[PDB]
């Protein structure tokens, strides 16, 4: 059955609701972004009304096959009327298609559902400036102080300058960068960009990215492995045996692999700074774990809903266990009494 903190009260919506069956009072399903934790559930078979994105709905038609009928795409940063209910959809800063969605409630209740986002202050100018939101349903993934994690640019510097001087001192080492779901497709675009060189992935892959709107895609990636120097390859593979079996495979073309994992945050970041960062290496091979997030660190979380000055705070992540949401609960009240909300 339905958890409440996937409800929106006085209204027939649900967000992110797709594996419950058909829920008791829906009339509209809306989705934030195709990650499978949030989709799991659709399909060809789907016959409710389900609003998203425009790149979210091009996913769910292509990949999922759900019939176009029920796919109501809405544009970004417009007031629309949904079932007789205001509504916006926002950019998340998560992966692409992704958002946010502010509901005006007929009785004068606003509320946002952040879905997955990264919080960042150029959200404090977009049309959430212009009114008092009284919820908030909160993406609060690294709600702790132990999670800080640098910003995207400082890892795509840092992953780029690597790359760039590993090819340059041998021309025949290869790029591997690992990848389960959309998202963090900068990692391997902004190497394949500083190298000259396309991005090589298997058929499904490319169809995927293919759906996302991203300008000049056709310039950046193809299914063409041998005219490549930087592939794509499930998560999974990326550890020393699936590479050394993807290395034979090039057919001695390549006799070094120079290997990413994106990972959200890991314990190396208490301690050490991106540049500080070093690999694992077996005989020709290294795996960098690289800090790339696309959810809020506790600072820019915190920074976010100090701005917004919510009347109600909803968490939607690491709801499960009593000491997690207390230790959120905990910490939502010290970011009112500093605020003076
Ligand atoms: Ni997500």
Redesign the pocket.
């Given at each position: 059955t339905c958890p409440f903190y996937k409800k929106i009260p006085g209204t027939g919506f649900t967000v992110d609701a797709f594996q419950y069956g058909v829920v008791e009072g829906c009339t509209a399903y809306f989705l934030?972004?195709f990650?499978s934790?949030?989709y799991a559930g659709l399909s060809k078979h789907f016959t409710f009304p389900v609003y998203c994105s425009e790149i979210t709905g091009n996913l769910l038609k292509n990949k999922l096959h759900v019939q176009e009928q029920y796919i109501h795409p809405l544009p970004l940063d417009t007031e629309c009327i949904v079932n007789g209910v205001k509504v916006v959809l926002l950019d998340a800063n998560?992966?692409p298609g992704?958002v946010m969605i502010l509901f005006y409630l007929p009785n004068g209740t606003v509320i946002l559902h952040t879905?997955?986002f990264r919080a960042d202050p150029s959200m404090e100018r977009s049309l959430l400036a212009d009114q008092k939101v009284h919820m908030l349903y909160l993406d609060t993934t690294y709600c702790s102080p132990e999670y800080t994690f640098p910003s995207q640019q400082e890892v795509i510097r840092f992953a780029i300058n690597t790359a760039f001087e590993a090819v340059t001192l041998n021309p025949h080492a290869l790029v591997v960068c690992g990848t389960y779901?959309i998202?963090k497709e900068k990692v391997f675009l902004a190497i394949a960009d500083v190298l000259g060189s396309k991005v090589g992935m298997s058929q499904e892959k490319y169809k995927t990215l293919q759906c996302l709107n991203i300008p000049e895609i056709n310039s950046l990636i193809t299914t063409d492995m041998c005219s490549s120097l930087v592939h794509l390859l499930p998560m999974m593979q990326i550890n020393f045996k699936g590479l050394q079996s993807h290395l034979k495979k090039c057919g001695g073309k390549y006799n070094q692999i120079l290997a990413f994992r994106p990972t959200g945050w890991t314990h190396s970041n208490k301690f050490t700074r991106i540049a500080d960062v070093i690999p694992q290496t077996k005989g020709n091979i290294s795996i960098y774990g690289i800090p790339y997030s696309?959810?809020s660190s506790y600072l820019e979380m915190k920074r976010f809903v100090q701005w917004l000055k919510p009347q109600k705070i909803i968490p939607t992540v690491n709801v499960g266990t009593w000491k997690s949401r207390s230790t959120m609960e905990k910490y939502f009240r010290e970011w009112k009494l500093e605020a003076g909300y």
């Open positions: 934030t972004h990650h934790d949030h998560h992966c992704a879905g997955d779901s998202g696309e959810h």
